[PDB]
């Protein structure tokens, strides 16, 4: 009931020989797992918390210049001196000025000049780096019980939250009435945080690559520093003006926090006002269904009447949902539910919420099913008063194929090699595809590091044109060109 209502919801079918399934979890996305004879579960990654962040680098972003001082020297006696440049908290620059008798010295020519002033930082930026050991992933576990306050009730304590850390690969969750689930994930290889640093604004935050953060042209202290005055490369935020070779003046460059905001175009925003909360990234996992049970397999069949309290709704994936209340006697009991044809000859659809039960007579239940394309009929209850609900599904099987392969291509593109683990069951073809994806993606990332989508499209067009003007090399070139054009058009950055 957690996934029902989200567009970014995917279906995984079947289990391996070892009753395990490899899945990947995403923020804002979710996957539902069902098998031939197993309960159907809801999986959603909702929280990623990191402990003890370490300040990698503190960037100054607001500065002011005060206590400005300067003095000149007559030409050909070296450079002017203050007793003052000995201190690094000040910023100093040597420019070149004109001198003369009216300027206070007895020699004519170009003279030296130097200016220094306070460099006090008003507001600053801090970059926090966290080891993968300190990461924590929070996952909600929601069996398809179908209780009336469960569909999309993310704020309700209906599903079970599980906490997984790299310290324990095995995390084990007991479900009341559904057995106990074995959960395996790979937090360490989801995102290699050794190359990302948490950038924090006054009230906003972003997850950025470490290298680009190290290449920011702003004043900095090391994170371990506490003095708060040794600002390195201060010349990037000051300007020394020498209008007409008579006087050098220093002024402070403005506030780049809007400029920094612009510089974060391709970054992903997070927050750490009350803890390093991140809602970004993916987590590869292996789901073991060894000890999952079906709830209420000792409850008899419902014999009374049923009434519909909430009508059928059509999801984004061709599935349907309905809320029905049991009006008869014998609770608890199983809800009759078939997806039959017009002659009631051949079963057409399949239940998403397998063999549901009525926990309480007054409490309605939510049922999910996947009707086939075209006319479909939902049979709830039995005679007397057997409900038969007609439904129609738009589209076609060929369509279903085209959008499912589009979604597969998109998820493959946005995950990389790890997308082959979305529904992998250990097949040799899956391993071969994974290896090919790792090598191809490594080459692709090496060749397209730090390039925009527009210029990616340009390069792709060039490659296709080259391929069209050359046989095996030609087809390889046009293939790589079209796939990189798709990658460029699909990527948001």
């Amino acid at each position: 009931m957690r996934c029902i209502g989200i567009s970014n919801r995917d279906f995984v079918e079947g289990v391996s020989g070892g009753s395990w399934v490899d899945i990947v979890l995403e923020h804002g996305s979710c996957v539902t797992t069902m098998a031939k004879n197993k309960p159907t579960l809801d999986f959603e990654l909702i929280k990623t918390e990191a402990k003890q962040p370490a300040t990698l680098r503190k960037y100054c972003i607001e500065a002011k210049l005060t206590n400005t001082t300067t003095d000149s020297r007559c030409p050909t006696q070296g450079e002017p001196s203050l007793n003052e440049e000995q201190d690094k908290r000040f910023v100093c620059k040597h420019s070149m000025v004109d001198r003369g008798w009216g300027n206070g010295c007895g020699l004519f020519g170009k003279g030296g000049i130097v200016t220094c002033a306070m460099f006090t930082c008003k507001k600053n930026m801090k970059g926090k780096v966290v080891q993968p050991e300190n990461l924590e992933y929070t996952i909600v576990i929601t069996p398809h019980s179908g209780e009336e306050h469960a569909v999309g009730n993310d704020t309700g304590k209906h599903g079970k939250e599980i906490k997984i850390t790299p310290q324990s690969s095995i995390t084990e969750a007991e479900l009341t009435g559904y057995g106990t689930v074995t959960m395996e994930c790979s937090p360490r290889t989801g995102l290699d945080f050794n190359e990302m640093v948490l950038l924090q604004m006054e009230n906003k935050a972003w997850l950025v690559h470490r290298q680009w953060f190290l290449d920011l042209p702003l004043p900095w202290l090391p994170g371990a520093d506490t003095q708060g005055s040794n600002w390195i490369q201060k010349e990037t935020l000051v300007t020394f003006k020498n209008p007409h070779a008579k006087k050098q003046d220093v002024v402070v460059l403005g506030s780049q926090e809007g400029a920094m905001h612009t510089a974060l175009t391709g970054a992903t925003e997070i927050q750490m006002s009350s803890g390093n909360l991140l809602f970004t990234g993916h987590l590869k996992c292996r789901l073991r269904m060894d000890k999952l049970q079906l709830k209420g397999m000792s409850y008899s069949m419902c014999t009374g009447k049923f009434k519909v309290v909430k009508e059928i709704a059509e999801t984004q994936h061709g599935t349907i949902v309905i809320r029905v209340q049991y009006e008869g006697d014998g609770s608890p009991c199983k809800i009759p539910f078939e997806i039959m044809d017009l002659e009631k000859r051949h079963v057409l659809g399949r239940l998403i919420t397998v063999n549901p039960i009525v926990t309480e007579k007054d409490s309605p239940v939510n049922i999910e099913a996947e009707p086939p394309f075209g006319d479909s009929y939902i049979i709830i209850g039995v005679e007397p008063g057997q409900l038969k609900l007609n439904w129609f599904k738009k589209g076609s099987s060929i369509g279903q194929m085209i959008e499912t392969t589009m979604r597969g291509a998109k998820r493959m593109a946005i995950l990389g090699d790890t997308a082959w683990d979305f529904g992998s069951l250990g097949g040799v073809f899956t391993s071969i595809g994974k290896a090919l994806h790792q090598v191809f993606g490594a080459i692709y990332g090496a060749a397209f590091s730090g390039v925009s989508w527009t210029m990616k499209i340009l390069i792709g067009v060039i490659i296709t044109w080259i391929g069209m003007n050359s046989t095996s090399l030609s087809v390889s070139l046009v293939l790589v060109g079209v796939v990189t054009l798709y990658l460029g058009v699909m990527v948001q950055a």
Partner: antibody, heavy 127, light 109 residues
Framework: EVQLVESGAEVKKPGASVKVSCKAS????????MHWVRQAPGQRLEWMGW????????KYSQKFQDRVTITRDTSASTAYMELSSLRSEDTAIYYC?????????????????????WGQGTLVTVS | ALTQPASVSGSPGQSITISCTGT?????????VSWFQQHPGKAPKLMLY???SRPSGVSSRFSGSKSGNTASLTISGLQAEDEADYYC??????????FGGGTKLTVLA
Amino acid sequence: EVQLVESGAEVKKPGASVKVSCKASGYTFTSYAMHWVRQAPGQRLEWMGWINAGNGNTKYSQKFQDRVTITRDTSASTAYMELSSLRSEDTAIYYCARDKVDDYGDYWFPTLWYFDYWGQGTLVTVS
Amino acid sequence: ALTQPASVSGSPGQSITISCTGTSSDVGGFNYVSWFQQHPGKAPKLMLYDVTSRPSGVSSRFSGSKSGNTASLTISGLQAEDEADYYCSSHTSRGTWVFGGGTKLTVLA
């Protein structure tokens, strides 16, 4: 057995000079650094500095830079801590502690089990 | 300096946790976190160094752990002889040593 022996209690007027002796026995003195820690009665511990017996180099705390000088004696396997210009607030218990230097005869990175043994302490009262 | 509660009291045979807090240069960056027991009128003795590990001859009741910039000491099964002064010491980044303010442990009768 590593035994740390310290001198007896001493009383001196303010502004005088006091040198305390901490003698360590039962081990190779030259291959271990020597520490000096003070503590006001009923107060927290304060760390002055250390002397490396391998080379005799000195390092003191920032507060005690210009007033605390500590020397070592290889023959007697003892280290002498001398404090000059005593003040009424200097009245405290003084402990001498030991820890291992690296295999190169230097004390750059202290060992994990630093302050492995402690001396009985010397009580100094300032009038 | 190092910040820690002045006094901590607990019933005998119970489990209590005491924490020593410093800064990023000494506590939050290094594993040089050690705890010393100071008997009244007696020389200090180390009960714990390298909080992930324990010294020799010290009972396993004492356990130490570090959470970010705060280092914690946990004692299981409080007993009468545990009433003594406990100090947290850290070797700072600048090469010197910093000590806590001293903690008095009280066991209820």
